[PDB]
Design a protein around this ligand. Structure first.
Ligand SMILES: *[C@@H]1O[C@H](CO)[C@@H](O)[C@H](O)[C@H]1NC(C)=O
Lengths: 48, 41, 110, 122
């Protein structure tokens, strides 16, 4: 829902979505190749 | 409302502001339908 | 801690031949089709220079003779042809999980 | 363009502390992580820690967590590494270098390296 939303807000009015009470399948993130920048701070991406 | 001919909730008048929200939950109603309802909190 | 073993410890290869350096991982390195194994060349008295990243991709500026291959817990670095200036120590590094470790190194002799 | 400069050698008495400088130039210093790798003479390479100049976030290896303390100087674009309780086994060559850390890119691929500094503990 967050990644494939058709409309994204502007940077000055950035939209914030809270994600909780769910199981997070990160495999879609690694499988996706459209991503150009993937930097993680304070956590190993393989350890996510 | 005249068209719907029923009561519907206009707005949450309990609170003025909503900041730093943490948790949210949704489930089926259990208050609706000489019957006694008991809840322990 | 993933332990990387490099064989052979010392390799002698003449001009125009093929040199293969194999790095064995004690644990799986592949992660969703990505193998986090890097190859470096460290000339004596100098810092290591990156050659292969992700165990399959050649770094820009490196000659096409250097090539990487392997998957799962076994990876090999292939140099073909081997030139005179290839005398150095080659190290393999893994980055799938912390801490990142380096192999024992393979010394190449002409 | 991109240059990482280190002193040729450093001499420190055993049990003392030594401070290190890794001057960075030719690139945006705060956008690239800096790490230090220990190499004993005649041995392989050993990771010490990872630090991000932007915000000062630090990651330390469990073995070197009490031996090495890492700081940054964004004003001078210089990375600082401090070793305490130095012993004879700490005599090695440490290299400072930068990686872009992009998962769909190089990730922990270490393209460029600093010249390194050798320390004699005696
Ligand atoms: C769109 O959906 C795909 C479905 O796999 C996902 O991989 C991708 O990250 C989503 N977002 C994009 C393409 O921006």
């Amino acid at each position: 829902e967050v990644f494939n939303a058709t409309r994204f807000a502007s940077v000055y009015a950035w939209n914030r979505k809270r994600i909780s009470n769910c199981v997070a399948d990160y495999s879609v993130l690694y499988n996706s190749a459209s991503f150009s920048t993937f930097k993680c701070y304070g956590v190993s991406p393989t350890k996510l | 409302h005249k068209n719907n001919k029923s009561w519907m909730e206009s707005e949450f008048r309990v609170y003025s502001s909503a900041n730093n929200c943490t948790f949210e939950y949704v489930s089926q109603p259990f208050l609706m339908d000489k019957n006694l309802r008991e809840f322990v909190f | 801690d993933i332990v990387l073993t490099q064989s052979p410890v010392s390799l002698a290869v003449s001009l125009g031949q093929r040199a293969t350096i194999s790095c064995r991982a004690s644990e799986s390195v592949d992660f969703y089709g990505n193998s986090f194994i890097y190859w470096y060349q460290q000339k004596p008295g100098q810092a290591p220079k990156l050659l292969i990243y992700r165990a399959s991709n050649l770094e820009s500026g490196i000659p096409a003779r250097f090539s990487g291959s392997g998957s799962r817990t076994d990876f090999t670095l292939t140099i073909h042809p081997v030139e005179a200036d290839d005398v150095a120590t080659y190290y393999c590094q893994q980055s799938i999980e912390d801490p990142r470790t380096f192999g024992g190194g393979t010394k190449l002799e002409i | 363009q991109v240059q990482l400069q280190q002193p040729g050698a450093e001499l420190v008495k055993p049990g003392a502390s030594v401070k290190m400088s890794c001057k960075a130039s030719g690139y945006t210093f705060i956008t690239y992580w800096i790490t230090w790798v220990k190499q004993r003479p005649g041995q392989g390479l050993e990771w010490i820690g990872d630090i991000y100049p932007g915000g000062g976030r630090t990651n330390y290896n469990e073995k070197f967590k009490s031996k090495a303390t890492l700081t940054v100087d964004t004003s001078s674009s210089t990375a600082y590494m401090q070793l305490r309780s130095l012993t004879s086994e700490d005599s090695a060559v440490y290299y400072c270098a930068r990686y872009d850390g992009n998962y769909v890119g190089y990730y922990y691929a270490m393209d460029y390296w600093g010249q390194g500094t050798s320390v004699t503990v005696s």
